[PDB]
Symmetry: D2
Amino acid sequence: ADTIVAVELDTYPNTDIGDPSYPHIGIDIKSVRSKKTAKWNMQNGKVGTAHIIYNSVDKRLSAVVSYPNADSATVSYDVDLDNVLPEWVRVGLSASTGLYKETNTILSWSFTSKLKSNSTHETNALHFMFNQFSKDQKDLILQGDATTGTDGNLELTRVSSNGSPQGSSVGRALFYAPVHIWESSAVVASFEATFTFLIKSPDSHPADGIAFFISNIDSSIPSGSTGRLLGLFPDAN
Amino acid sequence: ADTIVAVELDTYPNTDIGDPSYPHIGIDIKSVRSKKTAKWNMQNGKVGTAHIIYNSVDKRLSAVVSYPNADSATVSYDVDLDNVLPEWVRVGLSASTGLYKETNTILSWSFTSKLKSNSTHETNALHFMFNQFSKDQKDLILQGDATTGTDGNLELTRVSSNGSPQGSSVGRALFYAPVHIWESSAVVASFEATFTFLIKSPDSHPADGIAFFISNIDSSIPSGSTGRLLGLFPDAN
Amino acid sequence: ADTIVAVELDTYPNTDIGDPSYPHIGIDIKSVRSKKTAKWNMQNGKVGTAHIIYNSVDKRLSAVVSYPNADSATVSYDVDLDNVLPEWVRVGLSASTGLYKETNTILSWSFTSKLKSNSTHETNALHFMFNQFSKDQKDLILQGDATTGTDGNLELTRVSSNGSPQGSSVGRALFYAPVHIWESSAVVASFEATFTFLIKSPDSHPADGIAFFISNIDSSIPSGSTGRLLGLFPDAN
Amino acid sequence: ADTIVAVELDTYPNTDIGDPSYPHIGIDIKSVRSKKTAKWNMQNGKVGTAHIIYNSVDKRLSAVVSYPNADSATVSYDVDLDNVLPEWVRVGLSASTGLYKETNTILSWSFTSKLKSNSTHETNALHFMFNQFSKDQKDLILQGDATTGTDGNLELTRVSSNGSPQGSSVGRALFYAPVHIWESSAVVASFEATFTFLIKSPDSHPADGIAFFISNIDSSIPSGSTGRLLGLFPDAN
Ligand SMILES: [Ca+2]
Ligand SMILES: [Ca+2]
Ligand SMILES: [Ca+2]
Ligand SMILES: [Ca+2]
Ligand SMILES: [Mn+2]
Ligand SMILES: [Mn+2]
Ligand SMILES: [Mn+2]
Ligand SMILES: [Mn+2]
């Protein structure tokens, strides 16, 4: 049903569904089994930053994840998103926990989309930036366990009062307005997304991860997508 | 019911509801009877540009309207919008015709809103720019007779096949996402809107005008607001 | 010689040249004796943020200074900068120490200038943002004791190896490119500047302050402007 | 001496130095003999738009050129600019005429550069946009025959009073401030340039072309680079 293109920051190695044996960042085109992955030296309790970029001329989705004072992890995949997504999509962040858990806190999120047409100066653009989230963020569609305002952050999965992450949680937050990613007279379409996150677990094996995703506008959390499916896919195919 | 703050480009002098005897630009705070107006040397058939700016430190809503090769018209009004509007609003463009008519074509529209909080670097922003409108613009809520895609323009009021404007028409287009204009820890909130329009009438007395407005998110066209009420107000009080 | 318009964050009350008896923020139009001031509850050792805005329609220069978890200080002054500055100016940050001292560290600085002409879509813009400063920042003109790269920050006045601020220091940093602030067919000109700073003194009476300023392009530090003159004015008239 | 990376809009086929037999767009890395070209259906007397993009993660320089109501031409080349250019560069536009000629008019030019560091939220950016050029554009370095203000346009090569293009002309315009394109803790560096141009010749064989280029900051026009060398290269090697 949903068409999902996602960049996952997967904290738990589910080697049985194709994950590598370490935290990794991957590019998922309609399947949790990433088309490409790169080792990610995930840092528990540290604030990281993910940058995702794409443009219709190169047709390459690339992502860079970094932590202050550390070397970055980057992954890229050649894919023509016009062939995968609808021309109107919603963008969001998703995260889950399963038997293992972690906080999936988002501290800021910005996104810029641009469609440059062939008429001179005909640029259509959408840009949003959230460096703080209020309890009543009317421009975000929160699905599942996702909540805003707790310390001005967006908590994608359930965290109990004493800051503790809860297992079997799944939450997503999508920007309210549809995003136009293809248009017939557009000569170049591009987007850039950036978000900082804080993944913290009391456990030595945090799970499951955070994913920036683009989907059909009506996307909703698939039943049973807690844990390894990142609140994005119905199954592991 | 609706709370409306609007900058009107009024093409027809309804001297009986307080308009001056000439085309004028005015600032309307909850009433069609503008709190302030300025003479506008409206140019039939020429593309104009309106710029509207406001920031919560100065609490002054200002608008400048110009035509290429001509002198601008500007109007400003001191008003604290925190005291008039809700903290979440929708922004839009509205226009109408009555017994007299004109095309109320919008060729481009950009808007930028910013809320700078007191935490270091905590900026929340929303920016959209439309330099072309497609027939299925999913990020715009079109109300009344407003349509998009005709020559990539947004036609706020009805235009028949042979380019002719129709009387008694009213249409509005609002950006889909709510806009956050006040937040408790914001030290400065500001917005800037710009739109180019083309008002053309076969008649010597075009009517009724175009208005950039900000309203409660659920605003809808008031019954009977064609003509002098600009699709914004229920009556002329 | 130099034409200076500056927003000062004055940490030391020189009541003899008109300062009030407390830290204050003020708007200086060609004189160190501010045209308007507001009490500033300056916080030693804390990172603050200053926002400065202005547009040619309202002709009001306004500034807001804040510290996380604290109430802001704001000051505004009605002034038509077209009547004070040249149409091409350089923008910068200046700071000084005298007998009393403090570190005048700048951690980030962004500036946006826009000139919207009367031709449809004719916007001229300049935007720079520095969230990190490198030792060889070729796009900044550093004058006096100002240095960059120390912890990626810009140190406007001299700081010795052990982090200690030195007295009788004065330094300014200007963006390399001239900024066009007036143009004959411009219907609205506006600018916005933001910078975060960290003023820290071992002493109970820090001095002298930091100032965001706009000047003729060839401005240089006036002789003897350490201390109370903020590296901006030749004398206290 | 100069390090030049340029995207050329070559109007004249100098098949002897490797041009194809038609107008073409090409990517030049330190040589006029393009590393990659694409046929360009150049339209004499029509305003076109060129878009150039690049980011350090993909290391692909791509350009798209279009005319209203026509299909675009696009060319891309895989190149790591960190390995070719200095970390501080100047960006510009260059053009020339030789025995054959054409007007090389620039109507608008925007450029955005971004360097995202590994510290959370550490973005350094530079953005300029010129939609009009004044006779005294102090933020542009004009070299050779380039002049500004004629109809608010930038004329890269000599045009006589009666609008006629002159042969053997060469002119370049560079943005005044150095641009920082690489920095040691940057996880992603990217730029985007856009410019609209109007190439008009009374002749059936216009020459020579327009080029968007990036170079060492001190670049100057090489002697003898009129005609086929586009005011960029000293020779045709
Ligand atoms: Ca996994
Ligand atoms: Ca009226
Ligand atoms: Ca003082
Ligand atoms: Ca050639
Ligand atoms: Mn995985
Ligand atoms: Mn009126
Ligand atoms: Mn003072
Ligand atoms: Mn060539």
